[PDB]
Amino acid sequence: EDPQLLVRVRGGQLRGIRLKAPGGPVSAFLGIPFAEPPVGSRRFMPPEPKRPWSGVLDATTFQNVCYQYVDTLYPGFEGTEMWNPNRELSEDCLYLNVWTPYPRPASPTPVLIWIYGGGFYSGAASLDVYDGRFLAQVEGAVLVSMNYRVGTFGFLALPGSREAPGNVGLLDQRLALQWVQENIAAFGGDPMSVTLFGESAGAASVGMHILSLPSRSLFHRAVLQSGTPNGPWATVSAGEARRRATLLARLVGCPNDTELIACLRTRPAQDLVDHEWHVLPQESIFRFSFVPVVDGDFLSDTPEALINTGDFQDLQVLVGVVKDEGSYFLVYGVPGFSKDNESLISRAQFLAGVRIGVPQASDLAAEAVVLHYTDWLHPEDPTHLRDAMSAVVGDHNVVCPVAQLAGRLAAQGARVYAYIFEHRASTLTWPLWMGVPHGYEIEFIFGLPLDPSLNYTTEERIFAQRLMKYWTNFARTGDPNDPRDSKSPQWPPYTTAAQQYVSLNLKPLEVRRGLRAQTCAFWNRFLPKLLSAT
Amino acid sequence: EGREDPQLLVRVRGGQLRGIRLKAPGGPVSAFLGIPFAEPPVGSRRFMPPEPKRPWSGVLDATTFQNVCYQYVDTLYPGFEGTEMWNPNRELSEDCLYLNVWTPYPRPASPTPVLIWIYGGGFYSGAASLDVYDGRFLAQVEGAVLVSMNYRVGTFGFLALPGSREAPGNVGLLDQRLALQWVQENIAAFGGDPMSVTLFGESAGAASVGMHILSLPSRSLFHRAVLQSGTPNGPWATVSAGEARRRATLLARLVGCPNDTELIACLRTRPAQDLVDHEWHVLPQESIFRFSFVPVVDGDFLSDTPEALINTGDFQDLQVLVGVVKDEGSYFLVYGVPGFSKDNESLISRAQFLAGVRIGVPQASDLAAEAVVLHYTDWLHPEDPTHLRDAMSAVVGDHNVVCPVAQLAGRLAAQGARVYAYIFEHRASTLTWPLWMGVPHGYEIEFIFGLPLDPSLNYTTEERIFAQRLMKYWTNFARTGDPNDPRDSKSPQWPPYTTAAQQYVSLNLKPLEVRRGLRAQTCAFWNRFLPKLLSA
Numbered sequence A: 001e002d003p004q005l006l007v008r009v010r011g012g013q014l015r016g017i018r019l020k021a022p023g024g025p026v027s028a029f030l031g032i033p034f035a036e037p038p039v040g041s042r043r044f045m046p047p048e049p050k051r052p053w054s055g056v057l058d059a060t061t062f063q064n065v066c067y068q069y070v071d072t073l074y075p076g077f078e079g080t081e082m083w084n085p086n087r088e089l090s091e092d093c094l095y096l097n098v099w100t101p102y103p104r105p106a107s108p109t110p111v112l113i114w115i116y117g118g119g120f121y122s123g124a125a126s127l128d129v130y131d132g133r134f135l136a137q138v139e140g141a142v143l144v145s146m147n148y149r150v151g152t153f154g155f156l157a158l159p160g161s162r163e164a165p166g167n168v169g170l171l172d173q174r175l176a177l178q179w180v181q182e183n184i185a186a187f188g189g190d191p192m193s194v195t196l197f198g199e200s201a202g203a204a205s206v207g208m209h210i211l212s213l214p215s216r217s218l219f220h221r222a223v224l225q226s227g228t229p230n231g232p233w234a235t236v237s238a239g240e241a242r243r244r245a246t247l248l249a250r251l252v253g254c255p256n257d258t259e260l261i262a263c264l265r266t267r268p269a270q271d272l273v274d275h276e277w278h279v280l281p282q283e284s285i286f287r288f289s290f291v292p293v294v295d296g297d298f299l300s301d302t303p304e305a306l307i308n309t310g311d312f313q314d315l316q317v318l319v320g321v322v323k324d325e326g327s328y329f330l331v332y333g334v335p336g337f338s339k340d341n342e343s344l345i346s347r348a349q350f351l352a353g354v355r356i357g358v359p360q361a362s363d364l365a366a367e368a369v370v371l372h373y374t375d376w377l378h379p380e381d382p383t384h385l386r387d388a389m390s391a392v393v394g395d396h397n398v399v400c401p402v403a404q405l406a407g408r409l410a411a412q413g414a415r416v417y418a419y420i421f422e423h424r425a426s427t428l429t430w431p432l433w434m435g436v437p438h439g440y441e442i443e444f445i446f447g448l449p450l451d452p453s454l455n456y457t458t459e460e461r462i463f464a465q466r467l468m469k470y471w472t473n474f475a476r477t478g479d480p481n482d483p484r485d486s487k488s489p490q491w492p493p494y495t496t497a498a499q500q501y502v503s504l505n506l507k508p509l510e511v512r513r514g515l516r517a518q519t520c521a522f523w524n525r526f527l528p529k530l531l532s533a534t
Numbered sequence B: 001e002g003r004e005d006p007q008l009l010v011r012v013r014g015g016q017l018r019g020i021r022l023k024a025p026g027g028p029v030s031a032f033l034g035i036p037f038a039e040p041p042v043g044s045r046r047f048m049p050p051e052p053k054r055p056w057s058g059v060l061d062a063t064t065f066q067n068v069c070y071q072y073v074d075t076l077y078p079g080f081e082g083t084e085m086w087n088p089n090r091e092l093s094e095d096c097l098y099l100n101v102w103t104p105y106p107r108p109a110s111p112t113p114v115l116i117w118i119y120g121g122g123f124y125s126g127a128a129s130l131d132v133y134d135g136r137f138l139a140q141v142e143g144a145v146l147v148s149m150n151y152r153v154g155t156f157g158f159l160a161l162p163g164s165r166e167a168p169g170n171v172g173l174l175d176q177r178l179a180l181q182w183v184q185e186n187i188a189a190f191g192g193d194p195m196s197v198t199l200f201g202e203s204a205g206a207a208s209v210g211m212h213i214l215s216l217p218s219r220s221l222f223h224r225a226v227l228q229s230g231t232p233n234g235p236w237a238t239v240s241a242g243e244a245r246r247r248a249t250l251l252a253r254l255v256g257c258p259n260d261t262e263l264i265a266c267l268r269t270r271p272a273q274d275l276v277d278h279e280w281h282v283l284p285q286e287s288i289f290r291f292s293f294v295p296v297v298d299g300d301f302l303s304d305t306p307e308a309l310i311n312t313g314d315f316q317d318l319q320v321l322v323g324v325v326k327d328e329g330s331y332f333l334v335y336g337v338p339g340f341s342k343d344n345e346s347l348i349s350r351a352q353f354l355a356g357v358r359i360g361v362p363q364a365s366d367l368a369a370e371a372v373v374l375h376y377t378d379w380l381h382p383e384d385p386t387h388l389r390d391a392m393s394a395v396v397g398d399h400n401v402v403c404p405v406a407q408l409a410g411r412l413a414a415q416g417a418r419v420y421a422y423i424f425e426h427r428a429s430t431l432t433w434p435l436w437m438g439v440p441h442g443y444e445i446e447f448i449f450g451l452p453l454d455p456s457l458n459y460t461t462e463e464r465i466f467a468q469r470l471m472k473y474w475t476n477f478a479r480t481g482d483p484n485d486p487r488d489s490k491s492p493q494w495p496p497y498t499t500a501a502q503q504y505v506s507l508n509l510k511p512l513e514v515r516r517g518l519r520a521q522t523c524a525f526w527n528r529f530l531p532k533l534l535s536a
C-alpha cells in the first residue's frame, strides 16, 4: 500500500488513488463523505456531520451526482453532455473530492475550493471540466470540490418552518468548507489560506458565503466567474419560495407546513423533478425554480441590501465574465434560436424574446430594453437583432450584476480584480454565432489544454498555463499578478474611479476601463427607477 | 424721371419703386429695400391678420431698410458683437411689414430662381435688415433674386385668443404668407421666376418654412424648402390652443386688462413697450429654448399638430434641404442655465448639470429628467466638469433641434419627399463667442449668404472658398432641387437622405464626407422612448 495515498481525517482513514497528470503523478481522494446522507426524513433538512467510520474508506472513485433534472435538448451532443451527470443520480450525494501533489506538500499549501454552477438545479464535482489534477500537478495546489444538493432537494423552502427552512444546499457547501478547516492540513493544505471559486450558480454561491457571517471564518479570498448573489435569478423572496413550494406540492398531490413537507418527503425523487419547471411565474429563460431564499437567517437581508451596506475591508475578490454571456441560454427557450442554424431573427422575434428574456419587465420597461439595444442604423438586421438578444440576456443576468457587485465591493473596502474572457476554444462544439459562451472559460482555468490527447492548440496550452497562474497567484496572495515576474503588463485592481479590468485572450493582458458602463447604468440605475414608480 | 439710373426704376402692383445700386465685391447689385406688402398693422389692426398694402402714388423710395418689428431686445452682453449682430438695426415700430429684394445689376434677361429668406429669433425677435442676411453676395455671385420680409413677432405676431375674431393667432405667419403672395404677383418685375421659389430660413425661420409646408394655402406659393437648425415639430415651435389662451390672458392681467372682445380691445390700448416688458413673464416653467408667443395649433393655419401633419402628410412632389450645426445647444446655455457664461469656460458641477437639465427640458417629469441625466452622463467620468458642460449643451441641442430635425427628415423621406441633410461643422475664424461653444447655433448663416466674400470682414481665404461652395449648394438646390453640381462629378456627391441609409454630409473646409445616421441612438431616446414614457 502506498503511504502517500493513505490519510487519516477526523472521521477515520481514507485511501486515495494516484492519478497521472501530463507532467507527473497526483494524489486524488475522491468521494469522501462530509455529511450524513440527506435521505428519508432528512430531505429538505440542514446537513448533519458524517459519523466516523471503521477501517479504511475507499476514496478512489467519484461518488453519486445529487438528484437533478437532466438536460435532453440535444441528445448525444458533447456541448450539452459535458454538463450532464457522469455518475449515478442519488439523494445520497454529499461527498467531496481532494487533489494534492504527489508526494504530498512538504509545507502547507494554499487551498482552492470549487463550487460548481448549474442554476441551482444541476451540476456535479465529477465533471471532466472540473478535474483538479492539472492545478495540483503544475501549480502545486490543493484543490477541493464538493457535491451540494440542487433543485427541490437543495432549495425547496417553506420559510419559517423547522422542516424545510431553505438554503440547505448552501449549508451543504458550508459544511464542506468546515470539513476543509478541520481536515485539509492532513493532505498538506493550509486552512489559513482558502480561496473559494465557482462559476455561474457556483459564483453566486461563493457570493452568498461572502454575505453570510458564519461562512466568513471558513475562507479568506473569493473568485466569482460569471455569476453573482445580487441580480434577478440567484435569490427569491420568502413569499415567492413559499408559493413555489406550495404549488409543487399541489402538483404532486400533497397533502400546515409540517403535513405538506411530510407528504413531499414520501415522494420518489423523480416525482419532484417532473414538476420542477412548472412552478415559474412566467415563460422565461435564465430563471430557476428552487434557488437560495432571503430567509433572514443564512441571508439576513436581500443580497442587494447586503452588498450596499457591507464592510469588505479585509477581502480580496476576483470577478469576471465571458465575451458572450447570453448566447447559450437563447437556445433553451427563445423562439428562432438553435445551435443547428445561424439563428438570424426578425424584429418581431426580438420583441418577443425580450419579454421571455426579461420576464419580470413591464411593457414599458420591455420597450426601454428594445429601444436601447436596437441599432437604429440597422433596426431590422437579423444578425444585429440576434446578437442584441444575446446581449440583453447576458447583461441583465450576468455582466451588469457583476459590474454592480465589483463596484460595491470596491467602494466598501474590498480589493477587487476584474476580467473579461474572450478566447473561443478551438474545440468548441456550439456554433460560431454563440461566440465565447457562458461556461467555456472553465476548461482553461482548470488546465485541460495541458492534456495533449484533448487536441487543443499549443497557444491554448500556453494560455491555460497563464490562467492557472493568475488564479493560483490570487489564491496564494490575493493578487493575480506574478510577484517574481516583471513585465506583463500588470493587472490593476478594479476601482469605482478608474473601473479598470483586463482582457483574457491569447494576446498579452490589455487593460480596459468601464465594464459596459453606459448599458449597465441603464440596467442598474434607470430600470429600478422605472418600475419603482412606473 | 430723367437723370436717374434706368435700372433702378421698377413698377409693382402697388406702384412705382426706386431702388439703389449697391457694391458687392465682384460688382454691382440692385436692391429694393423697404417695400411695404401690408397695411401697417397698427391701432385697431393689432393682433389682426395682415391686409394687403393699398396702392401708393408717385415713386416710393426703396433705397433703405425699413422699421424692424416691435420686439424684445437682448441686453445680456452689451457692447459685444456676438449678441449685437442679432439686435435691431432700424427703428422698432408696429409699422414694420416691409420686404427687400436684391437682384443682379443689370437685372437678368431671363427669369431667375427666387430665394426667400425667413429670419429666426424664437418668434420674439429678428429683422430682414441685419447684416448677416445681406442678399448682395448671392445676387452678385450666383445671379440670384433674393427676397426677405419682416414679419410680426412676440405678442404682436403670435398672441392668440383662439376662436376669437380679434386675435386669431398665427398672424406673423400670415404676414410671411402675404409676402409670398407678393412675390408671386410681383417678382417678375425684377426678373425673378415665380415658378421657381425656394423658401429658406433658420431657427424659427426654419420652423416657419416647415409650417408653410404643412399649411395648404402656402403650398402654391413656393416649390422647395431649406430648414436650417429648426423645425415645425418639436417642443418649442408651437403651443396648443389652451396654452396660447392661458398665456394671452396672463399677459393681459400683467398689463392691467381684466369675453375676448373686451380683453383684446383693452390690449390694443396698451403701449407696445408694455407688452414687450411682460412677454417673458408668462412661460409656465423656468426654461431655456422656450418662447412665450409662437405659432398656435388653431385648426386653421395648422389644421393639426405638426407632429400629426408630418406623420400623415403626402410630400411627394417636394424637395427639402435640412440640417444642423455641430453645437446647437451651447448658445442657449448662457441665457438661463446657472453656471454658464461666455466669459469663462463654464465648467460645471454635477448638481449644476442636474439643475440645468430641469431648465433645459422644462416639460419633463422627474422620471424623464433622470432618464436624460442617465443617458447623457459618461459613467466613466460622471463628475468631470468639461464632460458635464458639453453634455448640457448636447441635451439642449438634441432635444430642441437635432432630434426634431432627424424626426422631420425621416417622416418627409418616408412619405415621398426628396430630402438632403447636412451637419455644418466649421467654426468661423472671426467668431467672438468663446471656444467652448464650438460651432454655435446661428453661425452657418454668414457663410450661406457669402459674407466671407467681403475682404473687409477678415475671413481667411479658405473660408472665402468654403462660402462659395455653400452658396453653390444652396442655389443649385434652389434651381433644381438637388445641391449637387450638374457637370462637376469628380467632386464627392451629396446623396439624398433616406430612412434606409440615413445619409447626410459634413459641411466644413474639407470636401464633402458622407455619414450615416443623424444621432441615431440618442434621437431614438428623444423621439421613440420619451414619448412612450409620457404615456403614463
Ligand SMILES: *[C@@H]1O[C@H](COC2O[C@@H](C)[C@@H](O)[C@@H](O)[C@@H]2O)[C@@H](O)[C@H](O)[C@H]1NC(C)=O
Pocket (backbone or CB within 6 Å): B338, B339, B340, B341, B343, B344, B345, B346, B347
Ligand atoms: C462663470 O461665470 C458664471 C456667471 O457669473 C459671472 O460670470 C463671470 C465671468 C464673472 O464675470 C462673474 O462676476 C459673473 O457673476 C458663474 O456662475 C460660474 O460659476 C463661473 N464659472 C467659474 C467657476 O468661474
Ligand SMILES: *[C@@H]1O[C@H](CO)[C@@H](O)[C@H](O)[C@H]1NC(C)=O
Pocket (backbone or CB within 6 Å): A335, A336, A337, A338, A340, A341, A342, A343, A344, A345
Ligand atoms: C433555426 O432552426 C430552428 C429549429 O430547427 C427554427 O425554429 C428556426 O426558425 C430556424 N431559424 C432560421 C434562421 O431559419
Ligand SMILES: *[C@@H]1O[C@H](CO)[C@@H](O)[C@H](O)[C@H]1NC(C)=O
Pocket (backbone or CB within 6 Å): B456, B457, B458
Ligand atoms: C480687419 O482687419 C483689419 C486690418 O488689420 C483691421 O484693422 C480691421 O479692424 C478688421 N475688421 C474687422 C471687421 O474686424
